[PDB]
Amino acid sequence: SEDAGLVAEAEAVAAGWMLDFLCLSLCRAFRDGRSEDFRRTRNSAEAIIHGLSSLTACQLRTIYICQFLTRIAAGKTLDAQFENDERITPLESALMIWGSIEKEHDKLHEEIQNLIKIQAIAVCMENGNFKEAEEVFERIFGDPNSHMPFKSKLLMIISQKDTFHSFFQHFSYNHMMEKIKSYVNYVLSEKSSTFLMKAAAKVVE
Amino acid sequence: SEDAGLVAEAEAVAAGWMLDFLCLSLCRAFRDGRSEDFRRTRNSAEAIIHGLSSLTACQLRTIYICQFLTRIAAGKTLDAQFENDERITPLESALMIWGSIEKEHDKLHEEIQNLIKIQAIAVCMENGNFKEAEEVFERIFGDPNSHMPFKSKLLMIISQKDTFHSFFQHFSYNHMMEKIKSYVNYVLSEKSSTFLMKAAAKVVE
Amino acid sequence: KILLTPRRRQRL
Amino acid sequence: ILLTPRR
To answer: Region TRFH mediates dimerization: which residues (chains A, B)?
Structure first.
C-alpha cells in the first residue's frame, strides 16, 4: 500500500480537499465576523498551503481567495505589511490579488475593484495621512494623465486635505465590505458542497 | 439558510479527519527521513488541532503519536523546550509521551523506551553537559523499577565522562531511529484505513 | 513570500 | 505546547 507514487497521488488529492474545506471555513468566519475562528482557520489554511507540492488552477484561485480575504480583513490596519515593498498598504495588496481572479465576471469585478480603490485612499485620508493618500493614489491609478473611474473625484478629495468627506460616506468601508460579502456568498455557493464539508455535514445532520 | 450550529459541528468532524490524515503524513515523512515535509506537516497538524471541539481517546492518542515523533525528531535539539519544566530535554519529553500512549507494553515498546533513555543521556554528553546527563539519568533511571541490562554501567560511563564508549557507539541514535521507524510502520498500517486517506487512495487507485 | 499573515511596518 | 517547542 505504501507505494510512493500512489501515496504521492493520494496526498495531492487530500490536500486539495483540505484547502477547499479551509477556504469554505475562512469565508464563513469572514462573512459572520467570527474574528477568532477566522484567525484559527487562517493559520490552518496558511500551513496547508505551505505544505502543497503542486497546484491546479482551482487551487491557485482558492489561495488567491484566502489571500484576498485576509488583506480585506486587515484593510484599516495601515501598519500591516503584506508585500515585500513595505509601502504597499493592505487594501492595495487586496487590489493586486483581485487583479488575478474573477475577471470573467466583469461587472461585479469592476464594482469591487472600484470600492477597494476608493477605500484604499479613504483609510489614509481618515487617518490624516494625506501624503500617503497621494502616494497610494499614484500607485493605484497609474499615469497621472490616464483616466479611470472615480480617479478625478478622488484627486479632488485628496487635494482638499480633510479627514472627512461625504463621498466616503456613500462609498464607505461598510459598503465595500457588503459587496465583498456578496462575492463571498458566491464562493460559498460554489464550495459549500465540496467533498470534506459535505461528508462532515451528513455525519452531524 | 444554513444552520450555524450544524456547520460548526461539521467543521469539528472534518478537523478530526484531517488530524488522522496529517498524522499519517507525519509518520511517512519521519520514516523516510523527509525533514522539510516533516516540519511543514507538523505545522499543519498543529494548526488543525485547534478545530477540534472535544477530544476522544483515539484523538488524544493520535495527538500523542504526533507529539512523540516531533520530540524524537528534535532529539538532538537541546534548544527546544517541550515541557513547562525547562529542564526536561526533548528525548525525555518523548519518553513521557511514550509512556502516555494507550498501547501494549511489549518487547518492542520496552526496547524503544530504553533506547530513548540511552540517547537522552548520550546527547547531553555529546554536548559536554555531563551534569545534565546525570540529572537525566536520575529522572529516567532513578526508579528501582526502571530496570535495564547495563543500567549501572550507563551511569558509570556518564560519571567518567566517557561520551564515546562502545555502549553509545552500539546503542546509537540511528539504532534508536530504526526501532522507532519500525513502530511507525505499524501506525501506518493501522491508520491507513482512516476516512480521508482511504477516500483519497480510492480516487487514485 | 508573505502568504496569509502580514509583518509590522512599525518595527526595527 | 503541542507539537512545536518553546525556546
So the answer is: 2-205
Q: Which domains does chain B have, with CATH numbers?
A: 1-205 (1.25.40.210)
Instruction: Tell me the residue type at D4.
Output: T
Partner residue opposite A79 with nearest CB, options C3, C5, C10: C10
Q: How was this model experimentally determined?
A: X-ray
Q: A83 touching C, CB under 8 A? A: yes
CB contact under 8 A, A86 and C9: yes
How far is it, in rounded angstroms, from Cα B113 to Cα B99? 8
> Cα separations (Å) of B48 from A22, A53, B55, B58, B156?
10, 19, 13, 16, 45
Whether the CB of B42 is below 8 Å from some CB of chain D: the reply is yes
Tell me the three cell numbers of residue A170.
Answer: 456613500
List the grid coordinates of A25: 471555513
Please report the sign of the dihedral spanned by the C-alpha atoms of residue A170, residue A172, residue A176, residue A177. negative
Resolution of the solved structure (Å): 2.1
Of A7, A43, A195, the CB nearest to B28: A7
Tell me how far CA of residue A151 lies from CA of A76, A110, A131, A139, in angstroms: 21, 14, 16, 12
Give B127→chain D minimum CA distance, Å: 17
Q: Extract the C-alpha cell encoding A155.
A: 484627486
